[PDB]
């Protein structure tokens with residue numbers, strides 16, 4: 001009974017540390033066959049798209065249009081979904097993703113301002129009814145996420161955005177999470193141990209209810 005779990009949040013939200021907790025939890029619950037995926041990326045094509053999308057001046061001085069941005073995130077996503085994720089799930093292997101469609105809804109929807117209706121029809125046109133079985137949205141303030149991204153190194157094209165861009169993106173993450181009960185909003189502005197605990201119980205409960 002394979003499942004697709006996705007972790008979401010701004011850069012700097014600590015999604016890898018969150019995945020470590022998710023893995024430990026699942027393992028303690030006897031769930032051990034799983035593979036990881038990260039978006040944008042995960043296949044030769046997705047990795048090339050990832051570079052065009054994030055590398056500073058990937059296309060010189062030309063500015064990538066918001067819609068071209070949206071469509072490349074979707075090209076990378078569907079490539080990954082169809083050639084990696086689905087087959088893994090069809091094989092009984094669980095899949096834990098670092099970002100998925102919610103990222104597009106929050107960043108291109110909230111941060112860029114692309115119409116939600118449009119994003120919805122794109123998602124349906126491209127992915128149909130495929131959705132993650134559980135999503136863990138790690139909520140962190142924009143200032144803390146950015147501080148962490150900068151401490152890490154050079155900022156990608158999107159992370160170089162304004163505070164207002166991240167502010168809008170965060171809000172839309174919450175807004176979308178509020179309308180889907182399978183998307184849990186985890187308070188990640190709390191100390192690490194508190195965060196890790198929230199994740200562990202949420203996951204444990206969801207699995208028990210499986």
Ligand SMILES: Cc1cn([C@H]2C[C@H](O)[C@@H](COP(=O)(O)OP(=O)(O)OP(=O)(O)OP(=O)(O)OP(=O)(O)OC[C@H]3O[C@@H](n4cnc5c(N)ncnc54)[C@H](O)[C@@H]3O)O2)c(=O)[nH]c1=O
Nearest residue numbers: 011012013014015016017039040073103104107148152158
């Ligand atoms: C899929 C998609 C993405 N995007 C945007 C989202 C992004 O802005 C950008 C690049 O996306 P990317 O995720 O590949 O970029 P990454 O560099 O991988 O960023 P992540 O989103 O994976 O960051 P995380 O914060 O989860 O990663 P983690 O490795 O856990 O931590 C990042 C750094 O923060 C520190 N950190 C983490 N937690 C910390 C804590 N509690 N205290 C202190 N520091 C902490 C870590 O030490 C590390 O340096 O693309 C869209 O616009 N639309 C889409 O559809």
